[PDB]
Amino acid sequence: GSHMLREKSEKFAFQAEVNRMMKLIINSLYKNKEIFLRELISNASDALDKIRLISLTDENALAGNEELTVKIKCDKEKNLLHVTDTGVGMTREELVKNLGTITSELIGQFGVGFYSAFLVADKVIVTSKHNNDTQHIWESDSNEFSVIADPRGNTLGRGTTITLVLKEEASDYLELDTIKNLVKKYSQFINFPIYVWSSKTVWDWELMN
Ligand SMILES: CCCNC(=O)[C@H]1O[C@@H](n2cnc3c(N)ncnc32)[C@H](O)[C@@H]1O
Ligand SMILES: [Mg+2]
């Protein structure tokens, strides 16, 4: 089973238009970086709408995970921010196509906000499980991207986790108070329940909307 690593078939280049779009998004939102969270939450909401629709006509749609939620975790020690939804997920092919091929209001309207994650992160990782495929991991530092089968197996059930390796200067997004304030603000009109893993010292999910 060494064919894939030896041939490097897990490696991909972004489409030129995507490189151009990433630069446009990043340069224009430089003074309003916090918008990245609003966009990841919006994308999660869209994914939840999709599986909700599919569940109307597909009786086994929610079998891999019965809930419809967005859950956010701050891992200060590991310098990571996780945004996990139990939406429709993406197959390995969708990770390649949907993320690798193709002003705050416009960005949100055309739904290309995913790329704004690079305003606060040196690396963006997307772990996803779709009913029609096994769990896969997409990763990128914006200069290329790779997609590999998740060696951890099916841990998500169904859904997607966006993991951000935050830039040194973006450490404030690991602060619970900062994240609750933003998540509360950006989840206000989202129809699905959004939670933030927080302490009260005991930890548990805190409903934000
Ligand atoms: C061109 C901008 C980048 N592409 C996306 O955000 C697309 O990738 C997929 N996507 C992004 N976040 C997602 C999520 N949390 N669940 C499912 N699909 C997602 C959707 O098809 C989006 O339209
Ligand atoms: Mg502060």
In the numeric block, which tokens belong to residue 68? 């419809």
Distance CA 13, CA 26 (A): 19
Resolution of the solved structure (Å): 1.5
What's the structural domain count of the chain? 1
Distance CA 141, CA 139 (A): 7
* Beta strand segments in the chain, E: 11-12, 70-75, 80-85, 121-129, 136-140, 145-149, 159-166, 194-199, 203-207
Dist. CA 112 → ligand 2 center (Å) = 28
- The 8 Å CB, 24+ separation contacts for 144-148 are 144/11, 144/12, 144/13, 144/14, 145/11, 145/12, 145/14, 145/99, 145/100, 146/10, 146/11, 146/12, 147/10, 147/12, 147/92, 147/95, 147/96, 148/10
Dist. CA 179 → ligand 2 center (Å) = 10
- Look at the block and give the residue holding tokens 């530092």: 141
Beta bridge partners of 160: 85, 128
Return the C-alpha torsion angle 108, 112, 118, 119, nearest 10.
-30
Q: Whose CA is nearest to atom 21 of ligand 1?
A: 98
Q: Whose CA is nearest to atom 8 of ligand 1?
A: 98
Atom of ligand 1 nearest to the CA of 85: 15
Beta bridge partners of 75: 80
Closest-lying ligand to the alpha carbon of 182? 2
Q: Using alpha carbons only, how large is the chain's radius of gyration in Å?
A: 17
The CATH number of residue 169's host domain is 3.30.565.10
Distance CA 45, CA 2 (A): 38
Closest-lying ligand to the alpha carbon of 39? 1
- 114 near 46, Cβ under 8 Å? no
43 is in an annotated binding site: yes
Dist. CA 175 → ligand 2 center (Å) = 8
Pocket of ligand 1 (CB under 6 A): 43-44, 47, 85, 87-88, 90, 98-99, 102, 111-112, 114, 160
Task: Name the burial class of residue 133, with classes exposed (0-12), middle (13-18) and buried (19+) by CB atoms within 10 angstroms of its CB.
Answer: middle
Closest-lying ligand to the alpha carbon of 176? 2
Domain that holds residue 69: 1-209
Pick the closest to residue 147 from 112, 98, 81, 85 (CA basis): 98
| 76 contact partners, CB below 8 Å, separation of at least 6 | 174, 175
Q: Up-side HSE of residue 38: CA atoms within 13 Å toward CB?
A: 17
- Look at the block and give the residue holding tokens 């108070």: 177
Residue positions counted in the chain: 209
Give the helix, strand, coil percentages of the chain, each rounded to 5: 40, 25, 35
